[PDB]
Amino acid sequence: HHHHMHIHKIQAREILDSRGNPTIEADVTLTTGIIGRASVPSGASTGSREACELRDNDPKRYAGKGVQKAVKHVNNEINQALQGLSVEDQENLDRILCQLDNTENKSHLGANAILATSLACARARALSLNQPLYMTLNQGDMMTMPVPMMNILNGGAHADNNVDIQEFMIMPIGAPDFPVALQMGTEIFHVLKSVLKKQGLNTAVGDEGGFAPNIQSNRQALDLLSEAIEKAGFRLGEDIVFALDVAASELFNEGFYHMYSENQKFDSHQLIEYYANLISSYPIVSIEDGLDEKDWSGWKQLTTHLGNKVQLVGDDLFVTNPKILREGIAQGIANAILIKVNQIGTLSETRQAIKLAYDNGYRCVMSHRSGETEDTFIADLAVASGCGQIKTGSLCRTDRTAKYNQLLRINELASLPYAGKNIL
Amino acid sequence: HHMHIHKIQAREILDSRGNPTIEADVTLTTGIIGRASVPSGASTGSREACELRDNDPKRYAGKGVQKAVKHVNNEINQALQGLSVEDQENLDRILCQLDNTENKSHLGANAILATSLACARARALSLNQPLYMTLNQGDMMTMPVPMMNILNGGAHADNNVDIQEFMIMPIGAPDFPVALQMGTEIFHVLKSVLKKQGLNTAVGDEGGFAPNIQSNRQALDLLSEAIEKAGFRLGEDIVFALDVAASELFNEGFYHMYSENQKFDSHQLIEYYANLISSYPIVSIEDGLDEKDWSGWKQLTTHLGNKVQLVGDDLFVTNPKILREGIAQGIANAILIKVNQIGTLSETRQAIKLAYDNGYRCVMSHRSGETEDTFIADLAVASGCGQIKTGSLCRTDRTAKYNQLLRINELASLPYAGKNILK
Ligand SMILES: O=C(O)[C@@H](CO)OP(=O)(O)O
Ligand SMILES: O=C(O)[C@@H](CO)OP(=O)(O)O
Numbered sequence: 139h140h141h142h143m144h145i146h147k148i149q150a151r152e153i154l155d156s157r158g159n160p161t162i163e164a165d166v167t168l169t170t171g172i173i174g175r176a177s178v179p180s181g182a183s184t185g186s187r188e189a190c191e192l193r194d195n196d197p198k199r200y201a202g203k204g205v206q207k208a209v210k211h212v213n214n215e216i217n218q219a220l221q222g223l224s225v226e227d228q229e230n231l232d233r234i235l236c237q238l239d240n241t242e243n244k245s246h247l248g249a250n251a252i253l254a255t256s257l258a259c260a261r262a263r264a265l266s267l268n269q270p271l272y273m274t275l276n277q278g279d280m281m282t283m284p285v286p287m288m289n290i291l292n293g294g295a296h297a298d299n300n301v302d303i304q305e306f307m308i309m310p311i312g313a314p315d316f317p318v319a320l321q322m323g324t325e326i327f328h329v330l331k332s333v334l335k336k337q338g339l340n341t342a343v344g345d346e347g348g349f350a351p352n353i354q355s356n357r358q359a360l361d362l363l364s365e366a367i368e369k370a371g372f373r374l375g376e377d378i379v380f381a382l383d384v385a386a387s388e389l390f391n392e393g394f395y396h397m398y399s400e401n402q403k404f405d406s407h408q409l410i411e412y413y414a415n416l417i418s419s420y421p422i423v424s425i426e427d428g429l430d431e432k433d434w435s436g437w438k439q440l441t442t443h444l445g446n447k448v449q450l451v452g453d454d455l456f457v458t459n460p461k462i463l464r465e466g467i468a469q470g471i472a473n474a475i476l477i478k479v480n481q482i483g484t485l486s487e488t489r490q491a492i493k494l495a496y497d498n499g500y501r502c503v504m505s506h507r508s509g510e511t512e513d514t515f516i517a518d519l520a521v522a523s524g525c526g527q528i529k530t531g532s533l534c535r536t537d538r539t540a541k542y543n544q545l546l547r548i549n550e551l552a553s554l555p556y557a558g559k560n561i562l
Numbered sequence: 563h564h565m566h567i568h569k570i571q572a573r574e575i576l577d578s579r580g581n582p583t584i585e586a587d588v589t590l591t592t593g594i595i596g597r598a599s600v601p602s603g604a605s606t607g608s609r610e611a612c613e614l615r616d617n618d619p620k621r622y623a624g625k626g627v628q629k630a631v632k633h634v635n636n637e638i639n640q641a642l643q644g645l646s647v648e649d650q651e652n653l654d655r656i657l658c659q660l661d662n663t664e665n666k667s668h669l670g671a672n673a674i675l676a677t678s679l680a681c682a683r684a685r686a687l688s689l690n691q692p693l694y695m696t697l698n699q700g701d702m703m704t705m706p707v708p709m710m711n712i713l714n715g716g717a718h719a720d721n722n723v724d725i726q727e728f729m730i731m732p733i734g735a736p737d738f739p740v741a742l743q744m745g746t747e748i749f750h751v752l753k754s755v756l757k758k759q760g761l762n763t764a765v766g767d768e769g770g771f772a773p774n775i776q777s778n779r780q781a782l783d784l785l786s787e788a789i790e791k792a793g794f795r796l797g798e799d800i801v802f803a804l805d806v807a808a809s810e811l812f813n814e815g816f817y818h819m820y821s822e823n824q825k826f827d828s829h830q831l832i833e834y835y836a837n838l839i840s841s842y843p844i845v846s847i848e849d850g851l852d853e854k855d856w857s858g859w860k861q862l863t864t865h866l867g868n869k870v871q872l873v874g875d876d877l878f879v880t881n882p883k884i885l886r887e888g889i890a891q892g893i894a895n896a897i898l899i900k901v902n903q904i905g906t907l908s909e910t911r912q913a914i915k916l917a918y919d920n921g922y923r924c925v926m927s928h929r930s931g932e933t934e935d936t937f938i939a940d941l942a943v944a945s946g947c948g949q950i951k952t953g954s955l956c957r958t959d960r961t962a963k964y965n966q967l968l969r970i971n972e973l974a975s976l977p978y979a980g981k982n983i984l985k
């Protein structure tokens with residue numbers, strides 16, 4: 139009976155994210171007693187146009203980072219609005235949530251309250267259908283196991299070091315399947331630990347599980363990764379390529395981009411030249427947020443000059459927002475979008491962004507936040523969307539490895555191809 | 563009939579340090595699936611049950627667990643299919659007898675434990691009851707006081723710190739959510755304290771900061787400064803616990819405190835702890851002496867056991883036969899409970915009951931190599947042990963356990979162990 143998908147109760151609680159800050163988790167209980175659960179990640183280098191992450195700002199609790207207000211909105215307004223409604227229709231539930239909040243940026247209820255509900259409803263739906271979550275998320279796209287971009291040297295807002303570029307990533311594009319891709323990245327990660335240790339560089343880790351050494355230059359970081367790849371027995375280019383998340387909005391100040399580690403400051407034109415030179419020296423296949431979120435003329439120049447040679451991922455540029463991505467497509471800016479469910483606040487709006495990207499030749503990279511939880515939703519969503527690329531961290535910290543493990547579980551019975559070099 | 567096993571299977575997953583470990587799914591004839599994964603230590607005791615690895619240099623630098631996975635998929639599945647998960651003791655008996663070795667070196671303790679815990683979860687799902695409820699064996703349950711390792715050293719971090727774990731315990735909190743809040747607030751203040759002194763705030767394996775230190779006293783001074791700046795009171799609100807992991811420091815008749823350019827014989831190291839305890843509110847010392855230093859442990863227990871909790875970790879490796887001998891010799895007064903040091907839930911329960919029956923406390927513990935599995939949260943509550951050691955306040959390998967304790971606390975209606983752990 140289809141009344142078995144009707145909501146009995148929605149509740150929320152405050153839990154800790156992987157940096158030790160509060161975040162929200164929601165339980166959707168159906169009339170059958172089935173419970174869908176989901177928790178919400180939290181960024182550090184957040185774009186200025188991300189949907190509202192509602193915090194309490196009570197200095198006596200968690201230094202102002204409590205989320206009891208968002209929890210209360212789930213327990214009260216959201217529960218009352220959704221009780222008796224079916225989780226079978228994700229678009230309708232998400233529509234009701236957005237209409238209930240009735241603000242452009244989800245600043246009344248909180249995007250974290252809304253997203254916790256949205257994702258917990260999706261899980262309640264899958265449980266009701268008695269199907270794996272990734273199957274119930276698919277909207278017709280050919281599913282693949284994604285190529286992971288693995289952030290094994292952390293910098294910027296994610297680490298206590300002098301590194302300006304936020305993320306230095308390896309991508310095991312040459313692996314035959316996903317389990318071997320994970321093995322290759324893990325083996326390189328452990329070799330890199332030894333390479334850093336032999337050079338007296340720090341091997342404690344930053345927020346996403348990458349090592350946090352101080353570096354002489356961005357080229358030194360790429361040299362260290364290259365040395366670990368070689369010592370692990372793999373081939374640059376054929377087996378492993380590089381991806382960067384510069385998070386350049388964090389470096390932009392007073393009309394210039396500041397590479398403090400190299401005592402360099404660049405205008406947009408100079409920074410594009412800098413990337414062109416990096417790409418000619420290293421097999422970098424993707425650069426995320428190479429320019430500031432407001433530098434739309436720079437992004438257009440970057441896309442014209444290098445977009446045929448490299449993937450150009452908008453993160454803070456688009457904030458998983460269909461209306462912004464639409465304008466970017468119209469202006470020919472970037473050629474990929476980083477998909478972060480909590481930048482926009484609902485599964486349905488995330489799907490709108492994915493569809494708009496696919497329909498216009500943009501790739502999607504499914505992404506964690508730097509403040510993660512035990513929730514592995516993005517592993518299922520990455521496979522279901524067929525985006526072929528996932529960004530979910532280094533090879534240590536369970537906030538990252540839990541996603542890789544969930545992909546291993548999916549791979550077991552999915553009988554799906556590995557996206558491999560098709561992502562190029 | 564709903565508790566009969568249809569199938570058991572395993573898979574290789576990654577632990578929180580990036581090394582392979584094993585996860586098992588137990589499928590009942592009703593289709594209910596219990597799942598559990600197995601943690602892995604770094605500073606392992608010499609007498610821990612066998613963690614079976616593949617030793618294939620082509621895969622994961624020899625650390626794959628496909629051999630253990632195969633033992634679950636084949637030998638263990640065939641031995642258990644048809645049997646009931648309702649009787650945990652019976653299943654664990656059958657697994658140990660199937661292995662037929664003292665140290666579980668045939669099937670692997672990791673294969674056996676993954677099955678043991680997965681069966682426990684399948685049983686709980688079959689009863690439609692919270693896991694912690696189905697694990698209780700009559701003890702009064704409490705929400706445990708967490709000892710929170712916020713400054714990592716020893717085998718868990720790339721720094722000069724010899725002591726493995728510097729922990730705070732929010733013994734003065736009114737309930738568990740506030741206890742977690744206090745530890746978290748102190749953790750973030752400690753980050754600011756370290757940053758202001760130019761000390762490293764990247765983290766070690768258990769999520770504590772990994773700075774270099776001038777001395778163990780400086781580390782305790784830094785924690786004290788963070789406690790004070792966070793607005794809490796030493797002694798009344800927050801006390802300290804240490805895991806020295808002294809077996810890692812012991813060599814050729816001496817304990818080596820390289821960070822302090824000093825070495826100690828057993829007698830001298832006991833004096834060293836006496837002086838630390840007089841200067842700081844240290845209420846617990848874990849593995850203060852080497853796992854084989856049985857005369858030192860006796861002296862330590864006689865001299866300081868009435869002043870401080872003395873936790874055997876590598877000393878006992880969660881092993882009832884070893885703990886029984888330690889009790890008879892009067893060594894230590896608490897035991898660190900690590901399910902994968904012994905390999906079954908039933909043998910773990912034997913160690914807990916032996917400790918309880920002889921007035922020893924139990925501290926439910928993670929390993930430094932963790933997974934997303936939160937079993938020890940439910941087991942800590944169900945056992946009523948009142949103390950849990952499951953990491954700093956960052957890394958989901960640690961926070962997932964704290965979060966599970968928050969979930970249990972919602973409908974459990976249980977007291978917080980609080981200062982009662984000192985009695
Ligand atoms: O910028 C990013 O892409 C993310 C993920 O690595 O970091 P943050 O969540 O801090 O925005
Ligand atoms: O010694 C310990 O108590 C544990 C947990 O901190 O560490 P390891 O798992 O490496 O043995």
Ligand SMILES: [Mg+2]
Pocket residue numbers: 181182183184185385453
């Ligand atoms: Mg960011």
Ligand SMILES: [Mg+2]
Pocket residue numbers: 383385426427453454476
């Ligand atoms: Mg980014």
Ligand SMILES: [Mg+2]
Pocket residue numbers: 603604605606607807
């Ligand atoms: Mg140890």
Ligand SMILES: [Mg+2]
Pocket residue numbers: 805807848849875876898
């Ligand atoms: Mg120990």
